[PDB]
């Protein structure tokens, strides 16, 4: 047996896959410097932002007039979005619905409405049907989450509810995130309908008429869609992570506002100007960052690394080796 | 220079960097993106 981490001769044997090494110079591996500490930097915003009244609301809007709300400059918490109901559907595209407590987003959009029971599958990327092309359309590069839950005990009534409407007739399919509130009559025929009902003149709205008696696949469902935008920005909104003091001139691993890395942070001389947040290099990688608690610029440089070679005669003659470190001045090994 | 510039390709994945892929998706799903990136980079280096 041979231990591949005892001495350079053993490493050479382990690389060559042999118990005898002949005369020559062999390239064994590379040497790096490991991190010692760990820091996390997040913005100092501590207030919360509206999530209770988005879900604990009295009346949601119809499908064709879906309610839109913008969420920014807060601290998001998603633990409270667990006990909505005994059973509910929670599907996230582009993110996993367990890791969105340590991610920083630019702007959050919340769209709320109420849908027929069996049409929940139609709120999805690139799906066709009745509401996905005439009421609510989603893009093909969506990055967000969809939540749906039962609303029989609250919405359906015995006396009769007719306050929820959808649209059935339209010229062309809707652009994503586009709303229509027109009531102009349909023109299937060749003659004008002069704003009166008749054949080929249909009013492009319809009612649900929910009653507590229909089958399990027909009761109303409440649907809310969350849209994110994970890009480069001041990062107005993100969740509950505790900050830590920053260190300099030492190889550590860092998490700057959602950007994870390892390296050495140094005071910067770049000529940033107000709107510039971070910088790049020739190879399209991050080089400079701006600390979101002091508004100062730091430069990132990976800590020392290099290549190691072993010079030995044949194992038949001796077991002595010499080590060559490539491209380094060994006053700074 | 072109070998260096190939590092910004996506190869059908959701991002051109690895840390955000590992910090946004669960282990069951990040494997496809990691495989795509690894295969693309291996092909580029082999061609070189």
């Amino acid at each position: 047996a041979v231990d591949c981490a005892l001495d350079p001769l053993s490493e050479t044997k382990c690389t060559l896959k042999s118990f005898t090494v002949e005369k020559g110079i062999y390239q064994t591996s590379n040497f790096r410097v490991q991190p010692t500490e760990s820091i996390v930097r997040f913005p100092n915003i501590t207030n919360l932002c509206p999530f209770d009244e988005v879900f604990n609301a009295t009346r949601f809007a119809s499908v064709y007039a879906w309610n839109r709300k913008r969420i920014s400059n807060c601290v998001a918490d998603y633990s409270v979005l667990y006990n909505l109901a005994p059973f509910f559907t929670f599907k996230c595209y582009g993110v996993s619905p367990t890791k969105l407590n340590d991610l920083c987003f630019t702007n959050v959009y919340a769209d709320s409405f109420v849908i027929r029971g069996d049409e929940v599958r139609q709120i999805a990327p690139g799906q066709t049907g009745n509401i996905a092309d005439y009421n609510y359309k989603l893009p093909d590069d969506f990055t967000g989450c969809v939540i749906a839950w039962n609303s029989n005990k609250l919405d359906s009534k015995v006396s009769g509810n007719y306050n929820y409407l959808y649209r059935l007739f339209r010229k062309s399919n809707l652009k994503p995130f586009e709303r229509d509130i027109s009531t102009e009559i349909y023109q299937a025929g060749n003659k004008p309908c002069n704003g009166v009902a008749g054949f080929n003149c249909y009013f492009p709205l319809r009612s649900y008429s929910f009653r507590p008696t229909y089958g399990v696949g027909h009761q109303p469902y409440r649907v809310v869609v969350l849209s994110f935008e994970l890009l480069h920005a001041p990062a107005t909104v993100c969740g509950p992570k505790k900050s830590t003091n920053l260190v300099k001139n030492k190889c550590v691993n860092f998490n700057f506002n959602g950007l994870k890395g390892t390296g050495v942070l140094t005071e910067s001389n770049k000529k940033f100007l107000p709107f510039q947040q971070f910088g790049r290099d020739i190879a399209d990688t991050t080089d400079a960052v701006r600390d979101p608690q002091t508004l100062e610029i730091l430069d990132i440089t990976p800590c020392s690394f290099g290549g190691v070679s072993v010079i030995t005669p044949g194992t038949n003659t001796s077991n002595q080796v010499a080590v060559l470190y490539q491209g380094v001045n060994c006053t700074e090994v | 220079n072109t070998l260096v510039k190939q590092l910004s390709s996506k190869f059908g994945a959701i991002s051109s960097v690895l840390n955000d892929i590992f910090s946004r998706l669960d282990p069951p799903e990040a494997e496809v993106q990691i495989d795509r990136l690894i295969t693309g980079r291996l092909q580029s280096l082999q061609t070189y």
């Binding site: 290099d281 020739i282 190879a283 990976p302 290549g307 490539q326 491209g327 | 260096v4 590092l7």
Partner: peptide
């Protein structure tokens, strides 16, 4: 020599960026 000097003069940050990706150049 004179001609050798002329020939040597005739033929002539990116290096650091390449090195930080793992590509190095060995000496003769």
């Amino acid at each position: 020599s004179f001609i050798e000097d002329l020939l040597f003069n005739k033929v002539t940050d990116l290096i650091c960026a390449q090195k930080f990706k793992g590509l190095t150049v060995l000496p003769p």
